[PDB]
Design a protein around this nucleic acid. Structure first.
Ligand SMILES: [Cl-]
Ligand SMILES: [Mg+2]
Length: 276
DNA sequence: CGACGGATCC
DNA sequence: GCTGATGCGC
DNA sequence: GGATCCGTCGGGCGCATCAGC
């Protein structure tokens, strides 16, 4: 079945206006995405903070267009040292963060280009591109060990400010989160192991899934569709992209959006409105 | 990873 | 420099 | 025998490298 995201709720449950708009997008090759007009869409969305995953681009190769974003002038980029044509993440912000760091503990030695942490006045933002279990699950055990290291890292953050974790967490948590649950239980993104890891992430940190909090029983809401077999035209998809929030931020949560119509990748953007 | 062919279930 | 094939991973 | 369950298979994407010219 097709899906139509409901209108933007820009007011909190207690009536407070949203003050912060965050957009996250796995762009599947930043340079390709820009050629497919992805930045034109970003300009229309006008987020305060933009988080990008799978940039597949070292910072020296960023298109000049990215320098022509006055409203997102503070930009932080990370790419793996070994395999530059893969992974890569970015965080772009209207206001300058207080602190920016990279990775989950040892990036200076294992520069993976998957995680950026930025502290702002009232909250800490983490964006992540979680490692894929791979075709045939050949890297599933590495993904499980990474999941564990990531949980521990997030739990270990020194700041007492609430956390927003966003990005491509590369798992459909529950059956409602993809079109073909039965057929994919032995595929990357929907193994019991990855689902369990997501459940453990939520419990251990702890975090709430902003979209599912607001729309607990809404099916056919996806953020990824394989380029194969015209899957997007049939809305045969997976919800892989999340905004996860500290419990203390739920009163500030206005809406969590899925921007189904925005093209340029095999993922679509997601957008968060907070009243801070 | 969705499409497909084959087997199994009541 | 530029194209298109192959390799790799998503 | 329609629905379900399950394993196998071919192929869209982007980017790096390579061969050729
Ligand atoms: Cl940077
Ligand atoms: Mg991808």
């Amino acid at each position: 079945a097709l899906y139509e995201d409901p209108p933007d709720q820009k007011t909190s449950p207690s009536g407070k206006p949203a003050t912060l708009k965050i957009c996250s997008w796995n762009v599947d090759g930043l340079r390709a995405w820009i050629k497919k007009k992805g930045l034109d869409w970003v300009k229309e969305e006008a987020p305060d903070i933009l988080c990008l995953q799978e940039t597949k681009c070292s910072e020296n190769k960023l298109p000049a267009e990215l320098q022509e974003l006055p409203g997102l002038s503070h930009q932080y980029w990370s790419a793996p040292s070994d395999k530059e044509g893969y992974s890569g993440v970015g965080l772009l912000s209207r206001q300058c963060p207080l602190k920016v760091s990279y990775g989950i503990g040892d990036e200076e030695h294992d520069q993976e280009g998957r995680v950026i942490v930025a502290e702002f006045d009232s909250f800490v933002l983490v964006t992540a591109y979680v490692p894929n279990a791979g075709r045939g699950l050949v890297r599933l055990e590495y993904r499980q060990r990474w999941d564990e290291a990531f949980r521990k890292f997030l739990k270990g953050l020194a700041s007492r400010k609430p956390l927003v974790l966003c990005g491509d967490l590369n798992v459909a948590h529950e059956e409602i989160d993809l079109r073909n649950p039965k057929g994919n239980k032995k595929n990357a993104g929907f193994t019991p192991q990855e689902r369990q890891g997501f459940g453990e992430l939520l419990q251990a940190v702890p975090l709430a899934d902003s979209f599912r909090h607001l729309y607990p029983n809404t099916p056919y809401a996806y953020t990824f569709w394989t380029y194969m077999m015209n899957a997007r035209s049939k809305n045969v998809g997976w919800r892989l992209d999340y905004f996860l929030l500290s419990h203390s931020l739920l009163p500030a949560l206005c809406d969590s959006k899925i921007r189904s119509k925005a093209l340029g990748s095999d993922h679509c953007p997601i957008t968060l409105y907070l009243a801070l």
